[PDB]
């Protein structure tokens, strides 16, 4: 029964890696000290594997929670273009990452995690679609998930 969450994780993963063709797909998701493990992943072979990671930022309970609680979403073509420092991009650097899209997860009004892909070693320009399925797929996840209790 609960179990069965892992199931939609996987799902979104792998569909998520497929609809972007890009490199890694994760579900990451937050403990109550919005503390982060990445609990599915999709990953193309050769790329570095994050999961099952535990990775605190505490820039999400510092700053982000209700932004993402209320819908934001995060493009970026170029993790060097886009005001990300060297605190930042240290956590990205080992997975190789050089793209990346974030969209949220809301569960029963909360925020349970977030949806990441990442597009390694290239930068990339994200469309329009490909923000606007990425981040259907993250919400059909949720309401799925929140509809099963
Ligand atoms: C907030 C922040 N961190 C992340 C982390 C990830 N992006 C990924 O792709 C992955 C999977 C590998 C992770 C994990 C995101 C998406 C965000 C939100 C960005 C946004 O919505 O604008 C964040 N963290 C830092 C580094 C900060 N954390 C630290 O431990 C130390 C030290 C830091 C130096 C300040 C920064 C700079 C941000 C964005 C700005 C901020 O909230 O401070």
Known sequence: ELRDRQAIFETLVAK???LLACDRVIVYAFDDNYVGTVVA????????????????????????????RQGRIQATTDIFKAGLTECHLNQLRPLKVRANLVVPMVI???????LIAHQASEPRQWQEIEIDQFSELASTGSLVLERLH
């Open 16 to 18: 998520g890696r497929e």
């Open 108 to 114: 029963d009004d909360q925020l349970f995690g977030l």
């Open 41 to 68: 992943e999709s990953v193309a072979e050769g790329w570095p594997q994050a999961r099952d990671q535990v990775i605190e930022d505490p820039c999400f309970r510092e700053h982000w929670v209700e932004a993402y």
